[PDB]
Design a protein around this ligand. Sequence first.
Ligand SMILES: *Cc1c(COP(=O)(O)O)cnc(C)c1O
Ligand SMILES: *Cc1c(COP(=O)(O)O)cnc(C)c1O
Ligand SMILES: *Cc1c(COP(=O)(O)O)cnc(C)c1O
Ligand SMILES: *Cc1c(COP(=O)(O)O)cnc(C)c1O
Ligand code: NA
Ligand code: NA
Ligand code: NA
Ligand code: NA
Ligand code: NA
Ligand code: NA
Ligand code: NA
Ligand code: NA
Ligand code: NA
Ligand code: NA
Ligand code: NA
Ligand code: NA
Lengths: 380, 380, 380, 380
Amino acid sequence: SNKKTKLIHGGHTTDDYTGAVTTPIYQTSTYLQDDIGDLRQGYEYSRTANPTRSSVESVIATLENGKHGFAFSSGVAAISAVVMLLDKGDHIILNSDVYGGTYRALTKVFTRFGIEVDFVDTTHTDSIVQAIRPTTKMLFIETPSNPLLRVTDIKKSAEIAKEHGLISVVDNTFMTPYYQNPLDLGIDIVLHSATKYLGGHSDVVAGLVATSDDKLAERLAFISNSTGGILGPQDSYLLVRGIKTLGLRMEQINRSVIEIIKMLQAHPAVQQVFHPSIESHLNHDVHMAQADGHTGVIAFEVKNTESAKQLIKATSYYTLAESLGAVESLISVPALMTHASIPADIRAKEGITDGLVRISVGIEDTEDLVDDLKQALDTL
Amino acid sequence: SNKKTKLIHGGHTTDDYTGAVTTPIYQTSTYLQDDIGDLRQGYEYSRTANPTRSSVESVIATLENGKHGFAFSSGVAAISAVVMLLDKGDHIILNSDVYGGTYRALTKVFTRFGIEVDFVDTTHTDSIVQAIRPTTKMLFIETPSNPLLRVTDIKKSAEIAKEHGLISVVDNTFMTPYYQNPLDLGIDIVLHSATKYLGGHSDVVAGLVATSDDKLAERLAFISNSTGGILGPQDSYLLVRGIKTLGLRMEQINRSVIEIIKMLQAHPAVQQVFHPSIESHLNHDVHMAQADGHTGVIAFEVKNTESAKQLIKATSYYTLAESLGAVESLISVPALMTHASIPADIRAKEGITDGLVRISVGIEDTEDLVDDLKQALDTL
Amino acid sequence: SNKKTKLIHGGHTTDDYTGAVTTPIYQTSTYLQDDIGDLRQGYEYSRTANPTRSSVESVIATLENGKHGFAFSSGVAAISAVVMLLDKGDHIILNSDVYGGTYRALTKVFTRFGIEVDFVDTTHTDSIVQAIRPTTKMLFIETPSNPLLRVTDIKKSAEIAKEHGLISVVDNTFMTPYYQNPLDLGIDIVLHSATKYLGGHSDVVAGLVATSDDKLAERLAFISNSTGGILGPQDSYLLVRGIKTLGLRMEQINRSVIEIIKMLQAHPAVQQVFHPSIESHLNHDVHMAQADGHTGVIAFEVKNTESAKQLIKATSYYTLAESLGAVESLISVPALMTHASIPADIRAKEGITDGLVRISVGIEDTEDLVDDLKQALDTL
Amino acid sequence: SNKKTKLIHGGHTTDDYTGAVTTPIYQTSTYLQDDIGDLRQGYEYSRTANPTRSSVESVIATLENGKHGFAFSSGVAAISAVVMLLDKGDHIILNSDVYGGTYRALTKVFTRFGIEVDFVDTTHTDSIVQAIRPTTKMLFIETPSNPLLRVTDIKKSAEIAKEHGLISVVDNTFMTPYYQNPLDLGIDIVLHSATKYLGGHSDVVAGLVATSDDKLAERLAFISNSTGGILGPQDSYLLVRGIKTLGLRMEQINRSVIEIIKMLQAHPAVQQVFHPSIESHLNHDVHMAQADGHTGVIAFEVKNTESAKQLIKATSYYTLAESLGAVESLISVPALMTHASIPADIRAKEGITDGLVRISVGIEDTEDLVDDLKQALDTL
Ligand SMILES: *Cc1c(COP(=O)(O)O)cnc(C)c1O
Ligand SMILES: *Cc1c(COP(=O)(O)O)cnc(C)c1O
Ligand SMILES: *Cc1c(COP(=O)(O)O)cnc(C)c1O
Ligand SMILES: *Cc1c(COP(=O)(O)O)cnc(C)c1O
Ligand code: NA
Ligand code: NA
Ligand code: NA
Ligand code: NA
Ligand code: NA
Ligand code: NA
Ligand code: NA
Ligand code: NA
Ligand code: NA
Ligand code: NA
Ligand code: NA
Ligand code: NA
């Protein structure tokens, strides 16, 4: 019924055999056959299917209102499996602000296989219509984007993809299924770095994919079984466990996001602030119409790299590390860390400047997070 | 010094920090940075590197006498990462009876990416020389192959690859590093389904790759980080643990293999046996020159499908399941299981006859395994 | 600073060596020594100490404002270790409403070792003063109690224990350190079934003990090392992970508790309701003074066993199972399940009747939990 | 049939539900009930029973030819559960060189509970008969003992226990079920530190108990459920896995033991060797009659403390650490490590001399272990 209930009881995460209230961890590679080809419960080889992986796959399918879920060894592995739906000579359109690893995978791996890529400013969806070539087969969107939180109209993107015969993909990592459900808006495939919010505890690297399209699901299952980027059973289990608290965690994070943004907008050492909740933010109305909450990722400008480093050293509760969506609050400078692989001239033009700080708000106390960041900013 | 000692003390499998005699399980996604880019021990994000995965990578590098190891979420994922060393338009030669998953990855995924393939019978290495084009970049061989245990000259394949500028790859799953070391014989890259003997306990799906080539290692590390088919920390740990007993397990398996083959050759219900230890086996001398032991996979032909099925039902200690390299002895009928898509009128041409049985010998008592298979054969 | 921050950053739950932001899982039994008796990080044998166990021990010590923490294989193992502080001939006073397993351990195991036990109604603390014998060495209190939520004044109990030379113990399972901190009120030892709220995810059986008393800590460490009821490293890790979300979970649970109790008090099929938040509940003022929230365990009376069974079968979101403090809402009938080991005549006199239902409120949506239980009660 | 087969196929270590060839890891605390008291597969709460723990319990029962198995959080916890079979005033006889932790549990915990103890030299079983009182209820023996490998007649101890109405217990850690089966010789209860050989990989702390006596099993199950020193599911799984290779590991260890002893007896720097395989060892004939192999623990005397320390520093393949039964060969000096509390002037009386070295032989190559220890001895 309501989302917090669906998080606990949606999907298949109990044991039918013993009645155990959590998913057993099937640390196993193969399964006894009663007769040649007769599988007790449909399992024959864990790369093809594993019951704990099946559990987390059923969870992600349920939460995104899809029919089929797939668990991969990492988010980039989910992305690579989706890109392998295409052949040499196919073209894919992506939004122009994208995760550094997605940029690197597409431009340094898949272009070697003849897959053509254009990064387009999808914050106006008619840009997509101009960018469509006769060879375009896929439209791939992050919203909000990493790290500038650019917002793209999901429903309009889906309509464009349907009209032009494209596979539409949304990377829904930043919003989670708790706040934004691209499949409900006509998107073909939705995917996640489950490394971030879904796992939620900085202890699993994993990717998740969901679709309602039977033929896309069959093609993805074939790719996963043939290239083998599958999530292991222990990580699958820890993902199910982490997902249990996703709603509580996202709601704490959102409460903190609101206050932190107020502080940041008022602070003299802070210039521009990037977050879809700010009403002057481009496509703020689009975000409010396609999501009912916010990501915990915030970007904001300080003067320069050296102020950014001072800010990082003055905080007590923000941890300098990669990733986002942890219970711990994280801080980074994308131009020097996660987005160093994006060329510097494109970084400068897009606004990923040397003094752009990114924070992932965690689930610490709101007043502590605001006060800590504010006194650190006061140090400058 | 000797192999059984190297298995215990090779690689880095203790904790330098606490002194723990086993590798800690780093169930973690990210690592605190003391300053931007300043990593205490070189770790920043578990997809890029994870200390438990690094442990198992050091083990496989040591055991294969290489410099660099890589752990992937499956053997198929290791194979796919190695094939992604190539670009659209490059050509690769493989043995024609290569593992079905390798066949499917190449012909149903990578040919869509413009990679050209020739499948040749490599038991005569001039087959390889005939297939070489100006575009050939890679030579990929299993030895011995499945399920007929065809043997390929590793030293000559390496010489061919060196002379023509190819990256040579050996899938050494069936022999393990305990008996055959392709890198010592001039091969560029060696890889394993660690799902089989290396893990040894039918409880991990995993791939391992080793090389001594710094630039190949740099390229593989880039592919692994960008497409993300990495092995998780729990599975890496179980791999290190399983590998500890690899020599004891392989030696037990080999004693049973020898006695079982003696039984099979004497039995009236058996028309033919396939195993490289048999002196009339093709390239027996080649195998004895490049390996100092044997795989536990044996194939043998009985009268028909129904005799094969009877054999499965009459054994007490042979388990009907997919995979190989378990502690349990496993039994299968390739024409009904792994090769069912190949037609009956055509089966004879490839050698996958209706009465072809494959066993993966486990570590049960030799006398029990011999006696059990023998009395089952006596029921025919 | 504030509790939600302390939950994330309190205790030592990162890796000093690699910087990993979560506690490594030291699946290990022993530790290399650089010289005889020289321990790299103080570890020599995992039963004596294990770094992952040390992590969860530091967490529980921090959260209860103690100096020493101890992790046991179960709550009853924590309780048995604490009872083994006493000798044959010592006497212990417990409150008269206690967990069924605690009753069974004391009356069927430890009385065989000459430890004398009286269960006293501690809801008036002067009862304790009358019950003190010359041999009384320990005072052991649950508050609120299981399953009737009787409340005992912790501070007054501690004053009595100090004045009469008793070791005071509070079983703080139901309140968690998030709402009630017995050590701050003068109690010597605080303990938990970490199986319940602390782990929070129905996937760990564990006990935790905390004290500020150096000599009690030394005696407990000796008992734990000599009788060996230690928590394993994987369970220790899952406990740390679960504890991360304790504040969010308890706050959701408390929001639901308030509404569910309103519904239950208004419902015609429900007679008496047991929960410390109800202002007519005995020692409601005492509870509000020693805790700043509520447990999620509620007991209430329906007509009889058969109405209780009907109620259980009519709910959609309440799971019939043992334990409490899960993310899933649980329902039980204590007289038939957890408290069957308490004799029936004592059950009837104390109010643990055949129609007494116990619910553990989980973290599902409040409106769903209220509506589901209400329509189920309407079925009667 | 034969032992190596029984190790693989004995006990229940597959999943009946999915057919998984390994035991699922039930990381869970509680189980859904279809109706109050109606359990799908007999599970209601993981302290009482857990399916992964039940798997390892069935394994130890099978391997020791018993009916009932019990898994505890440590060997010391198994020992404590067995001792809690007694009441205040009961008397127990143990061999006088019993494991230090057993000595401490009995003399520093259980004597405070009114249990009376005699420590006697059991290498002559009439020692036992002399110590029997009317209050004697239990006889508890290790064979062979640590670190001098004293041998005790199991059959005669069982006859003594039967004649006088005692519960007989054998701590069979050093021999494992692979070589010695006390229950077959009339003993009531057999137990193990599974931390050592059974786990085999220095990565689990665990205890195991087996019996054929239904009423003893009922009493043990009650003690385990009420004091809660249960083994967790992850450790139970790692135990099942490690036990798979127990026979291969013990046989390798035994080959190395034989050759190493040949070396030690010939060496001028060695005054004396302690191991039951030596024909002049006390009760060598008794050991050969009750066991069909040997432990890997060997002790031998060199000149003094400084020669022992030199020996440790000169070895390449012997690791300085606590515990025994690793895949690594371990080396220790009992007078400086396990027996340091015993005074120097008194050391001689017990036989723990200053130059007494203990090694636990691992599964490294026999020639390496012999050569390494020999060249180290040559440095003296
Ligand atoms: C409510 C609920 C659903 C359905 O949720 P929708 O928002 O209607 O898709 C599915 N599963 C569970 C467990 C639920 O509680
Ligand atoms: C013997 C040994 C080696 C070297 O083995 P080679 O086959 O000679 O390369 C490496 N590491 C360890 C731990 C060894 O014992
Ligand atoms: C605030 C805080 C503490 C201290 O909490 P008290 O309530 O003063 O005992 C300890 N550790 C961390 C991480 C904190 O944030
Ligand atoms: C042989 C065998 C047994 C019986 O072993 P005994 O020593 O004769 O009791 C039991 N279980 C399995 C799986 C066996 O192979
Ligand atoms: Na469910
Ligand atoms: Na659709
Ligand atoms: Na090493
Ligand atoms: Na071709
Ligand atoms: Na040619
Ligand atoms: Na080379
Ligand atoms: Na911390
Ligand atoms: Na105090
Ligand atoms: Na079996
Ligand atoms: Na005595
Ligand atoms: Na006497
Ligand atoms: Na008996």
